[PDB]
């Protein structure tokens, strides 16, 4: 003879659940694997072996093609994650497109930290480990794609975030009123403020030993925006000057007129 309401679960928990539902790889899963058996790619021969029995031109071009495939899978994961962020799918279609366009690579290099240590990174759905040195050994311009992402990750990983923290950080990256060309900038600023408020509160509960963790993560978001600007520059050079380095259409769309 009344009407009681749903609940609801805390927004931080719902974003964390959306992140576990939508991403194949997470920091718990990657750390399990990285501790201990992924096949190590550390030279040309181990690369040909991993390729033969795992992924069915010139070596640098195949590593870059594998880089893109990973990005496309993750872009698709990020799009589904975005749709689970309350308010996101009620935005104009154009604004959703714009938020993802500018945000996916910031989110990709943020989450990439979870599968990287100082020696290398997990690849191929956790089944390979490619060493940082091997990546440095490739010929230009391919020898410098990954190293800046490793440098960001070593310092990001030192913050000791867990998946509950990263899901909100990623959500704040996506729900960003800073992006060029937004029309309903007011609605998106309110959505972002709500996400960032829950992030700030979550970091206080989850990391009470580190009272500057929230300003540290704000800086990391600005570091990520710069990292992506430089990445896209590097990607343009590769496309321009390597005829085998064709770009997947979804990724071209994203880079097209980005920075």
């Amino acid at each position: 003879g009344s009407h009681m309401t749903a609940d609801l679960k805390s927004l931080a928990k719902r974003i964390y659940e959306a992140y576990l539902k939508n991403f194949n790889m997470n920091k718990v899963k990657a750390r399990v694997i990285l501790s201990g058996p992924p096949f190590v790619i550390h030279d040309m021969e181990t690369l040909c072996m991993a390729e033969k029995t795992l992924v069915a031109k010139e070596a640098e071009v195949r590593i870059f093609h594998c880089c893109q495939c990973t990005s496309v899978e993750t872009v698709t994961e990020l799009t589904e994650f975005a749709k689970a962020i309350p308010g996101f799918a009620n935005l104009d279609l154009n604004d959703q497109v714009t938020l993802l366009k500018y945000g996916v690579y910031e989110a990709i290099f943020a989450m990439l930290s979870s599968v990287m240590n100082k020696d290398g990174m997990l690849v191929a759905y956790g089944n390979g480990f490619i060493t940082r040195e091997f990546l440095k050994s490739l010929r230009k311009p391919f020898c410098d794609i990954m190293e800046p992402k490793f440098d960001f990750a070593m310092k990001f990983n030192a913050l000791e975030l867990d998946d509950s923290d990263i899901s909100l950080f990623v959500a704040a990256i996506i729900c960003c009123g800073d992006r060029p060309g937004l029309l309903n900038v007011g609605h998106i600023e309110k959505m972002q403020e709500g996400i960032v408020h829950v992030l700030r509160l979550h970091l206080q509960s989850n990391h009470p030993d580190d009272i500057f963790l929230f300003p540290k993560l704000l800086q990391k978001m600005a570091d990520l925006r710069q990292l992506v600007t430089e990445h896209a520059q590097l990607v343009q050079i590769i496309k321009k000057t390597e005829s085998d380095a064709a770009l997947h259409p979804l990724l071209q769309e994203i880079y097209r007129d980005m920075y």
């Binding site: 872009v75 799009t79 154009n94 497109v97 259409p249 994203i254």
Partner: peptide, 14 residues
């Protein structure tokens, strides 16, 4: 129009 400049991303979001 973002949506038309991003047809595959657009498709992912429908």
């Amino acid at each position: 129009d973002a949506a038309s400049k991003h047809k595959q991303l657009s498709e992912l979001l429908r």
